[PDB]
Amino acid sequence: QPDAINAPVTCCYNFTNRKISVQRLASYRRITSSKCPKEAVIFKTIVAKEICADPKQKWVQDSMDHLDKQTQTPKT
């Protein structure tokens, strides 16, 4: 049984709905805890402003991917 229900469930409330420059997006940490009322993207901007963004958007599909492939260093 889930012996840990008193957990700080990192979630969101709103979602940056403005095409945030992929540049601003210093990183991304897709939230999705089983206790969060909603899934989201933690677009860690450059100033560390973690921005929950609707992953079902068309601008977060391009940015979230740019970060999904930003730390990928192909072994040369």
Next chain:
Amino acid sequence: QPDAINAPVTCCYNFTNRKISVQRLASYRRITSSKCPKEAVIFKTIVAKEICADPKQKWVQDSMDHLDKQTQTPKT
């Protein structure tokens, strides 16, 4: 004006109401974001099970203090 409302607001939902051994409490990160419906203590147990605990309890007043004074190294 708050230009960051699409934020992942680290919050909780329940609170460990059993006197958790201060030993188990590897650390503590008192939550209290202006967007969290409730304040809490992130009692990072030893297994890293962040446990939100009611700071208004009498067992979290002793433990939360033990962690509030666990990383304090008086310069000798």
